[PDB]
Structure 1
Amino acid sequence: NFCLWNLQPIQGSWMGAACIYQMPPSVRNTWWFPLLNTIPLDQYTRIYQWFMGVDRDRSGTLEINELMMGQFPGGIRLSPQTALRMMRIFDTDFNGHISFYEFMAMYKFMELAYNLFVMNARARSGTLEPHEILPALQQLGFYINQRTSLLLHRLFAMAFCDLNCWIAICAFAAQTRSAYQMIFMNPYYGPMKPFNPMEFGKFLDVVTSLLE
């Protein structure tokens, strides 16, 4: 719009630059960084309060044991496997710690996943049946096929897939996205191509098949 009363924020607004330049390069370079600009300041304090509840030794950081022990929004809990996936996604420094800014990303990611869970649990509230996994993952940007969606339900769930199992699936898909980023940063594979969600979906189908 060119309407004065309805002006939308632009990506990379000058007002955010101060904050952005102070952030660690690892954080700024990562595929999930744009999650950070979706969070209003007024939710900052809520997320920070949550962070404090998970940070059991008050280190100002989250370690894998804290993720395994933590309660997250919507009653989400993480198995040891899933806590490790969250570390591999969000500890972009590879130091074994999740910083507050890294947790903010993880929190938003979990809230996106939770929203799609509730939206796609239509046959039975609080569970995803196998046929609901495909659309929920597509909505999140993971363009997989039916074969793959049924394989993920089988690997990560039982009849139905509860919220925790859904978050496990989403963490696997996101860790594969990080792995993809790492692989294609290797200069052996030529100049880095822009991300193509359809091509990445095919990559995710293939890597999923390696899990069985």
Structure 2
Amino acid sequence: NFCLWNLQPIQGSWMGAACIYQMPPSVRNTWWFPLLNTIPLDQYTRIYQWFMGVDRDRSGTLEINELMMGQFPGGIRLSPQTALRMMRIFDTDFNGHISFYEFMAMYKFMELAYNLFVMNARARSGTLEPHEILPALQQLGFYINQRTSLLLHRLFAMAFCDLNCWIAICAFAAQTRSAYQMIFMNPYYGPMKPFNPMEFGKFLDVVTSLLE
């Protein structure tokens, strides 16, 4: 674009650098870090108010019990299992707590997932039928096959998969992205190839099949 009245922000704007440079290196290094630059200051402040309502001991961090007990936007609730998946995605320094910055990324992740649920729940409001899982995951960036989409519905759902079970699926897919990073950072496998979503999709198909 060259129009002065419609200029778009650039990735890596100098105006954000100082903040980014002060962030913990574990957070900056994660695959999901770009979520944080999708959040405007007004939403940062709403998210903080949400955080304060889930932060039962005013520690300024969330522990898995607070995730298990918390309510999230859109009525989302996290089972003990899904809460652990969220910890394994977002607790980037493996110390058993999620910081505010890690929670912001989790919140935005859930918002994206929520949006895709509502956009893809076409057959029956409030649920995803098995055939609706595939397009919703693809739109999120998870390029799986049909067999995988039906398996995910079966494992995480009932004939219908509600919002909470969808969040659980998305958490599994994201936790598998973190796993891929952990596996392939091992220098045994040589220099890490750039991320290819189609190739990661095959990895996700293989890993999902191990859940039965």
TM-score in terms of structure 2 length: 1.00
Q: Which runs of 5+ in 1 are unaligned?
A: none
Deviation at 1:134, TM superposition (A): 0.2
Secondary structure at the residue paired with 1:8?
coil
Secondary structure at the aligned position of 2:94 is classed as coil
State the distance in 1 between where 2:28 and 2:120 align. Answer: 32
- The Cα of 1:44 is off from its aligned counterpart by 1.0
Deviations 1:171-198 (A, max 9, x none): 0000000000010100000001100000
Per-residue Cα deviation, 1:15-37 (whole angstroms, up to 9, x for no partner) = 00010000000000000000000
- Post-superposition Cα deviations, 1:46-84, rounded to whole Å, max 9, x if no partner, equal 000000011101000000000000000000000000000
2-structure distance, mates of 1:70, 1:194: 36
Task: Show the 5 A alignment for 1:22-37.
Answer: 22-37=22-37
2-structure distance, mates of 1:59, 1:124: 41
**How many Å apart are 1:165 and its aligned residue?**
0.2
How far residue 152 of structure 1 moved from its aligned partner, in angstroms, is 0.2
* Secondary structure of the corresponding residue to residue 53 of structure 1: helix
- Per the TM alignment, residue 2 of structure 1 is displaced from its structure 2 partner at its CA by 0.8
What SS does the aligned partner of 1:166 have?
helix
Structure 1 counterpart of 2:76:
76
What's 2:51 paired with?
A: 51
> Alpha carbon RMSD of aligned pairs, Å?
0.3
Partners of 1:85 and 1:132 in 2: how far apart?
23
Please list every run of at least 4 consecutive aligned residues from structure 1 whose deviation after the TM superposition is greater than 6 angstroms.
Answer: none
Match in the other structure for 1:86: 86
1:107-160 per-position Cα deviation (integer Å, ceiling 9, x unaligned): 000000000000000000000000000000000000000000000000000010
Q: Distance in 1 between matches of 2:72 and 2:45?
A: 15
Partner of 2:99: 99
